[PDB]
Amino acid sequence: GALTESQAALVKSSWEEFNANIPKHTHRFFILVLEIAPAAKDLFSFLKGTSEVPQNNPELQAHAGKVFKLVYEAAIQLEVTGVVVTDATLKNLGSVHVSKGVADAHFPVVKEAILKTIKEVVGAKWSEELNSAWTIAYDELAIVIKKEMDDAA
Template sequence: MAILTDVQVALVKSSFEEFNSNIPKHTHHFFTLVLEIAPAAKDLFSFLKGTSEVPHNNPDLQAHAGKVFKLIYEAAIQLQENGAVATDATLKNLGSVHISKGVIDSHFPVVKEAILKTIKEVVGDKWSEELNIAWTIAYDELAIIIKKEVA
């Protein structure tokens, strides 16, 4: 069980707000990083199949990445308030969806690396080890729940 401090959650919240300030730019950057780290992951996303590069201003891409970052943000809040991420039908469904799309355990570190690099770019000079730790803990706790369905 991981608990985030008020300071850590405030850091996640402010960086999440900055991420949301330019969804097209930040979601494009996120998926570009995913494919730089793991080019074969392109086929896991319907909106990337048949493309040679990450499309700009793609509503499906933006919605998908936006949901990922929002789930991590919500996980951070739950970790502060309850000391755990609530396992609900939505998260269980996410596990099932990820299985059906071919997601395996080794994909999770790729997404985590891309998330952290995206947030680092989003916040620029405000990046800190504390911010890195907060996003890492929130992602890891969320991933545990989703992986239970994937395993």
């Protein structure tokens, strides 16, 4: 698909749609995560000692937001330039992931949780062309973070 002008127009549009609702889209995102893999709960400080996912914990929102931003930013950068650029941020990310005990078999957990989250986010507008555009952008970004964890470990 590549990322035509037409495809990127499609990712931007659908990211703007996600930020419009951060406490929802982020809490859904942690439930789609514990649905896919329950044990992950122990990993997150603010999830431990809890029994359910807190819905209004600022630490949790700030946390999940920052994840989706990072996937959008990557798509535009592929359309315009043709690649995903690796900066300071991307590498610190790879350290923290390893402290916290996180592995690669974890990544399809968080991808399916984010395609399912954006399918949920764009509803009927959804196209094959669009799913193909976010799929392309997540896979291209995770290829990069995995790459730095393996370096932070």
